[model samples]
Target: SPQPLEQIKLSESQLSGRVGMIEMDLASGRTLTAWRADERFPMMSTFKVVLCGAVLARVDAGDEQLERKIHYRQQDLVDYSPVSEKHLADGMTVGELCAAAITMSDNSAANLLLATVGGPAGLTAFLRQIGDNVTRLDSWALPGDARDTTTPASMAATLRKLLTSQRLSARSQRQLLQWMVDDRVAGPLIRSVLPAGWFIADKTGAGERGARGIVALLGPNNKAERIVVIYLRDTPASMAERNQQIAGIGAALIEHWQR
Candidate 1:
């Protein structure tokens, strides 16, 4: 196979889109591969991870608790809220909101958590605390707009710091990873392309103008040896095409991972 970067470029050519990606060793923080890593792309549902991180951080600081219940009315619901819609009567805890937001991409659940974390400004403060000034979430919209985006490099570094560093409490870290592992909506697409016996904890997003992306921790035997952040933007292609290209990049990385 060609080098990972060349293969990624080939994939980008087929879709006529800008591809931004970065692969980093989870243990050593060594950036193994990078292509257009500095370019920003819509974060979509990937921001849920960061929002949950803030929630956990606040919990660690005694400002929040995962067990606190959040009740809402039907009018507060947003589009594609699978989990939140069903629990209109009882309300969901912070932990449950995190699970639905991350695993199912529940939009209403995300908004609730977003509000609890003081919306975009609060999350931005959390990002600043973690040394990430590049990623931003401007609104609570679907897939996100131009003002709400993140660079692949920034996203990977933030993920590494939250998961691998002591930035988040140990239980909080485990909870975050567990939600990603149970991701049902977008997991199949990327998992189908990977070999058997491998593990993947990922969050994926799709938006207007063929914007698509995935942030994942993938490796063999249920271990996350590396972090892969890939983003696609401004592609006038089918969703199938975008998905194929994204999975193709993952395949190329796996094929040449030893490098």
Candidate 2:
């Protein structure tokens, strides 16, 4: 039998915030949660995964090519972007921009790709076509005038489709997983807490304020084994505390699934 989920406390300190979480054992179909997984919040950089998938779908249709050159407009530049800060005189290919977006969580790269995919509405349409109707991207860039939003449930469902559905080509799916595995940002939240020899492919998002999320596919040694974890913290907390909670949740899920 699955354990009582609400009994699990994520934070040691009684912080002034709420975290939305969902953990599923893909094989056994077991789930644990603190609140209804469909609660909506700004997904922060985690939305990039959605953007990446939309672009790749176009790629799979031969409408876009990775090697196609994209120049960084002045408006595309934003804070915390190592790729844009370097000010490459020659610009980069679509493939390179997507690589930077996933690996470094580069905002400029994300915006550029968002534009290439015909902006927020287009991305939302692609996700809906893939069977995730609850997610919405209202702005062209992050830190937008309005929140670019999704629910933990939507993320979990979308990731499952991205990996399992035949909607995206095998090459495109390979690219998404490879870039995510190469991700440096999600290491602390997903990889840092796992037992030895376990592996994960994931994406993480954080904002200047109360938006942080991580979506991960976990199993033994790079196999999916149907274990998916989606965690989202939507209110302010110290970065240290947030990271601790993320690791705690991850550890608890591992413990439950392994048993």
Candidate 3:
């Protein structure tokens, strides 16, 4: 069972920038939130999940498959990319691209997948079709003139759709969720503060202007039955400050729910 929101305390000193958070108790139909959960913030790499869904939707419609292969080009390379850093070579499959994009937050892999889905405009349309009107992918790569963005409530809504609305095929949904759990970008944000017996499936985003965000499903004993979303931005804080702020929030949530 989850704890009551009134029993959980969040100190002012723990926060460093604007925050948007929403946590729900599935069993009791209860909810808790702080800051502006409905307001939008730059999603950074967190938008990759939506991008993944767009590709998988084509698969669900018999237009694509995981086995599809794509050749990697030098132009596809982007800075700070693990795929490029590792010299991942050319001729990787779509499935491989998806894994690299989600788990490693590889910019090249993400750009390639976004292009295959017809670019950011395509992803925006796909999100609208799926009822996520609040998310928009503004660019194929990071540090763009325009940035990708979403609200905590919007993200949580999408996660619910992926978990229960059956928007994607079971195989697709499970595979993507697994990738979220394995996410390398922001995995530590929540897990770093987690108590024993708890598990999380999440996606993390960070990039230019100190933008950071995390969307997670957390639960006791690895059951992963809870939703916890956070987004922060518009501050000149260092990565350490942003990371500590997120970890602090995650720790608070854990202490509350795991009690």
Candidate 4:
């Protein structure tokens, strides 16, 4: 059951007015078509991809407790939240908070886990070990730092490595993708453009100043591939406009598949 790939001009204008990177694997794991794969941009919530992986890595090592409850501290709160006051007051298990971090993209959950896993310096060490040196989360919620960036290629390589079980054990790796599949919020980006029957595991990174980030699993019939795609905009038109752009990239990619 081989799938055929068709001819695609892949014009630059199609991705007009956006700063992004994409690596599509039409051939195999070793080959890729890329644009700005090495270009660094503000990572936004895409850093959560690494955060989730880092936490899961720790859990795999038996150094962190997944079921441990984390009480929200004043320092951990970010500007926005999907969970209501009641849920926050109830406190959340480490596993639940990690889920919220990926699915809801909640800052509180991320900050809490960030601290629980030994702060920025420790995470930095883990990032180095994984060879994700460029994808740095220098400040938790502090913001405005030069090193706070990542490229589509780097993030993709991180996930790609994880997929191959190069970073974590098989069990922890499955949990990683599962957490992404269980993401609570859904939007028009990766989900909107992909085929209906396929299931995708992804995280969307978005913020004001028209910033949008996406790293997702997409293909025919939910087959996992090493492909990684991301978009970063300093002054995007709007959230809706960003969504259109993101979905359009995926749709155009789908058109390349001959089926």
Best by TM-score: 1
Cα lDDT of model 2 by residue, 13-112, tens digit: 3444556666665545456453557767677788887788888988999999999998766765877788765656788888888888988898889988
Clash count per candidate: 0, 1, 0, 0
Q: How close is candidate 4 to the true structure, as a TM-score?
A: 0.83
Better TM-score candidate (1, 4):
1
Output the lDDT of residue 233, model 4: 55
lDDT (10s digit) by residue, model 1, range 205-235: 8888888889999877667989999999888
Please give, for residues 1-259, the per-residue lDDT of candidate 3 as tens digits. Answer: 1233332224223444467777865334256654577877888877887788788888988998999888776776887577644554656778888888888888888888899898989888888998988888877623333457788788787777765567899898788788888877667655665777788888788866667777787888778777787777665778788777677666666766543
What is the Å distance of residue 39 in model 2 from its true position?
Answer: 0.9
Candidate 1 at 105: error in angstroms? Answer: 0.6
Order candidates by lDDT, high to low: 1, 3, 2, 4
lDDT of each: 0.88, 0.72, 0.73, 0.67
Clashing pairs in 1: none
TM-score of each: 0.95, 0.86, 0.86, 0.83
| Best-fitting candidate, scored by lDDT | 1
Instruction: Locate the minimum summed-lDDT window of 10 residues in model 4.
Output: 1-10
How far in Å is the alpha carbon of 11 misplaced in model 1?
1.5
> Which consecutive 10 residues in model 3 have the weakest lDDT in total?
4-13
Off by over 4 Å in 3: 1-16, 25-30, 84-89, 141-147, 186-193
lDDT of 4 by residue, 46-72 (tens): 677678688888888898777888777
